[PDB]
Design a protein around this motif. Structure first.
Motif, short mmCIF file in Angstrom:
data_model
loop_
_atom_site.label_atom_id
_atom_site.label_comp_id
_atom_site.label_asym_id
_atom_site.label_seq_id
_atom_site.Cartn_x
_atom_site.Cartn_y
_atom_site.Cartn_z
N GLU A 175 -5.46 -0.37 10.09
CA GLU A 175 -5.58 -1.66 10.36
C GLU A 175 -4.19 -2.18 9.42
O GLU A 175 -3.46 -3.12 9.44
CB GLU A 175 -6.76 -2.35 9.80
CG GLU A 175 -7.90 -1.88 10.86
CD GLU A 175 -9.20 -2.61 10.75
OE1 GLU A 175 -9.36 -3.02 9.46
OE2 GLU A 175 -10.01 -2.64 11.43
N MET A 176 -4.35 -1.63 7.92
CA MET A 176 -3.05 -2.05 7.07
C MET A 176 -1.80 -1.82 7.97
O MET A 176 -0.99 -2.49 7.86
CB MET A 176 -3.31 -1.32 5.95
CG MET A 176 -4.23 -1.93 5.03
SD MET A 176 -3.98 -1.46 3.25
CE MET A 176 -5.01 -2.09 2.08
N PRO A 201 0.86 -1.35 0.02
CA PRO A 201 -0.02 0.00 -0.16
C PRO A 201 0.73 1.48 -0.06
O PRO A 201 1.64 1.39 0.89
CB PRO A 201 -0.69 -0.06 1.16
CG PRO A 201 0.02 -0.90 2.27
CD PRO A 201 0.87 -1.85 1.20
N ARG A 220 4.44 1.85 8.38
CA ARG A 220 4.00 2.99 7.54
C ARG A 220 3.69 2.70 6.15
O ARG A 220 3.99 1.64 5.57
CB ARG A 220 4.97 4.24 7.46
CG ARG A 220 6.29 3.83 6.65
CD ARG A 220 7.25 5.09 6.34
NE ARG A 220 8.35 4.46 5.86
CZ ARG A 220 8.77 4.56 4.32
NH1 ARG A 220 7.87 4.71 3.54
NH2 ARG A 220 9.79 4.41 4.16
N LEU A 221 2.82 3.27 5.47
CA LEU A 221 2.55 3.32 4.04
C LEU A 221 3.92 3.50 3.07
O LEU A 221 4.74 4.27 3.66
CB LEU A 221 1.40 3.96 3.27
CG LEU A 221 0.09 3.46 4.23
CD1 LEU A 221 -0.99 4.34 3.41
CD2 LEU A 221 -0.26 2.19 4.26
N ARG A 230 0.03 -4.24 9.82
CA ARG A 230 0.25 -5.63 9.33
C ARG A 230 1.77 -5.26 8.54
O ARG A 230 2.12 -6.01 7.53
CB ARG A 230 -0.66 -6.05 8.24
CG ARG A 230 -2.10 -6.33 9.00
CD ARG A 230 -3.03 -6.82 8.02
NE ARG A 230 -3.03 -6.26 6.71
CZ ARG A 230 -3.63 -6.74 5.75
NH1 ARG A 230 -4.63 -7.73 5.81
NH2 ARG A 230 -3.45 -6.43 4.62
#
Lengths: 279, 281, 278, 279
Positions: free
Chosen positions: C213-214, C208, C222-223, C217
């Motif tokens: 929630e992402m 991502p 961080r994105l 994982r």
């Protein structure tokens, strides 16, 4: 030379690609850093500003490589003798690394042994030598450094050099394939487990690097062997802050060899235009 | 039991699936054959007519299991004490196998050790124990038997029991992941190298087979339950049978769908309700 | 913010990493180059000296991006309208690329569509839209350019942007997973088949890129950023990577290894719980 | 003829599962009138299933249905269907449910393929293969799945791909692409549709009996081509209740071909005993 005609389209670039101070202030630890790929990676790291520490069994080779690199770059390269099979020696080596240079920001596990043999000619001792050096040695280095980084609340980028045949298997290099596959699983495991501690882990899988290679060139789509300098550019990128979100990756560095080998109908490259025209 | 509702669609069949006496006249060697998965595989092989030899460290457990199986099936089960970490003991064990039963047609490498731990709490001795048993032990067994089969000009089917986390990696079981991945590469190597010698090699990658992880695991398993040892034994006996004589170098997940569920980036959206989906649309 | 504490150890570097003239004299063609990741890759390519050609459906978006990039870098960016679902439009677009800029040295297949849906709610039209754009569109572009490069005896580096879920599968993005997996097989096939013609093909599989929630994982906490993706993409399309061919590179902060490991959820166990378990 | 080691890997052509293993079950097989599809249908019918076969050529389907049902005594229904056409697929699934019932077993085997340099492919040729293989399997799978959800029934799905779906391969590139898409589809639905009682597995075949074929044998560790009967034993196992916990699996059925192809040093099988001794 022995290169195929398409190699004109894939000429190697041998110069460091990252900015000249990209590793200023950083410390790097490289097992097998005295020779071959380890020496090439250390050379690029040192050229880019890193303070490097190299470790392997032969202190004379390590000290010669360290003086050669540091004379060229002006940046310190420290040699520490270490047999990675010996977990107690690894522990002391990591303590010495921290004392002489500091906690490492970059860790490269490259020490390996290999020999080509029919598997039925292997002895239990030959088997154990390869798995002890490649798998256990990388485990001891990685775990010992990791424990120290956790204690210090510091992070780092780890890189392991395996091979395309770790993931596929291969006859005749079976112990190396097994040990190197174990190293891959170890690094994927720690990428997932140790993010909270600021440690990321990646793998490069090399094909044949220049250092019976006519037969090999015929199976390489890029039409030539790889170079240590190109490998060092890839390795320094992965160990640099530009790659701070690259973690758990497995990167083939092979000129296309593995995709060529693995594809069921790729041998039809031998069919000529004239033969295709004739259905 | 603790099973999820959809388990109703995926009930286990516990009886052997292959024909009676499908292994008549065959010899099988099973490491770890005295307990758990190894015992279940030995039971099915013996039921189907094989003469079995089981080997592990505890001779009393091995003898008890051998008597238990052979008294049900009427086919002999031999017990041999062997620590697979010791290549000299492996050598002597293979010699005894050949003397008491004959060259094996079926070899199952199942002996293992494991424990769950943060990797930063591992010691070199714990690391070595797992890798020695799983990776070196399987290598010694496989190489020793292979050399004897080459000398006898006989072939065989080999099976190694690994795990879904050998290929993926996993935190907390990292030594096991590493050793078991080594076993996978070993078997793919020998499948490619030893075809000329009549030996084929396959891998089963199990998920969880029948205390808080087990409940959470069921929520991550599409089939909604743990696997059974009988089902694993059906898969193993098939792969070790002549019906699978062209299956070689294969890796087979036996996991109720666990690995595909775990690995897919958006699979957690199973929790989104019908009404929430209407809104999202 | 939403970032996890360990993100402090993995801060992004947003500057282009390659030397300022790394793409001088090169021509790059980027599908979807007007927005998002395609725009970021085009921006870095142009900054490093490339002449770029960007193609997608919306000519106004493409022209605005072209002007934005070229104004800042001084290097030309040409916009061409092209719906990659239409092979005749692809053919005409490639002809225009060769006329206005030249044969491309760099080809990036990034145009895509996607939506999240339970698979039982998919219709044939929705299925077709995603597969036609992603899989057939990338095939048409790759085949058309490749045929032109073969005729010209000129090489190039190709890059396809897929996703970590192409290799794994994933529920709820099933058409995208299928199409993107097809793109991966296509590129591995051509890496082996067309190396003899001087073309190499690599794949980046993103996680991502800029929810909480992402982030829980993702080991890096961080994105990802588009600039980091563009540094990886420009490296792979540069001559510094001329021996990288057939590679598949996860760019995901560790997400896929975290997701795929059976016991990785035990990260929630506390130090005290582990002490107790011992 | 086969390679010398083939004597160690002789095929068994008889069904391995118990005689009534599919009694009361309904199976739907695309491409069931010919080749592998016909072999799978034959074994399913022999073991008690009521089968429904679907493809474009109704005359071939009818001939195969009569041939199988006359030997087994179990009904085989033919339904004409071009899987490229989603409306025809919808109608075919409704006819399946009306004439036989909801399927317990779904096998997607219909495919097209041809070997060609990729630069000789046309856009229409590309689209034909992806439409038949990828879109056709999607339409069948989704339409059946929606009906099974409506009825609160489960099933076992099986897709026949190929070893080159996962690896890629030149010269079969559209097939590789479409078949890889099928693999991702099936792994996706295994993870998504557990709550609905549907499991999905993949068989990846190597070369199956019925020029290149002699060369292929030299790359197959088992030393021969596979047989359709052996494939049917594997397929019927995977679609049987004995495999009710096998879901999301991808199984190579290839005599070892893929591991042989993919391993970097496997070509050293040509080195002789005397050459190895010298080393």
């Amino acid at each position: 030379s022995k290169d195929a005609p398409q190699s004109k389209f894939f000429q190697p670039v041998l110069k460091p690609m990252l900015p000249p101070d990209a590793f200023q202030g950083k410390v790097a630890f490289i097992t097998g850093g005295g020779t071959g790929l380890g020496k090439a990676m250390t050379t690029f790291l040192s050229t880019l500003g890193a303070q490097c520490v190299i470790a392997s069994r032969n202190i004379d080779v390590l000290k010669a490589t360290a003086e050669e690199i540091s004379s060229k770059t002006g940046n310190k390269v420290h040699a520490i003798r270490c047999d990675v099979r010996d977990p107690d020696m690894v522990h002391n080596t990591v303590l010495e690394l921290i004392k002489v240079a500091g906690h490492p920001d970059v860790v490269i596990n490259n020490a390996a042994g290999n020999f080509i043999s029919p598997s039925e000619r292997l002895t239990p001792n030959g088997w154990k030598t390869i798995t002890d050096i490649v798998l256990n040695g990388t485990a001891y280095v990685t775990l010992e450094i990791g424990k120290q980084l956790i204690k210090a609340q510091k992070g780092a980028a780890f890189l392991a050099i395996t091979t395309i045949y770790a993931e596929s298997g291969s006859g005749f290099v079976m112990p190396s394939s097994s040990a190197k596959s174990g190293v891959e699983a170890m690094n994927k495991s720690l990428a997932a487990e140790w993010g909270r501690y600021g440690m990321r882990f990646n793998i490069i899988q090399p094909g044949p690097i220049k250092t019976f290679e006519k037969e090999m060139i015929d199976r390489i789509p890029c039409g030539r062997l790889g170079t240590m300098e190109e490998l060092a550019n890839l390795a320094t990128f992965l160990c640099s802050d530009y790659a701070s979100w690259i973690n758990g990756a497995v990167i083939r560095f092979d000129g296309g060899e593995e995709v060529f080998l693995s594809g069921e109908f790729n041998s039809l490259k031998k069919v000529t235009k004239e033969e295709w025209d004739i259905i």
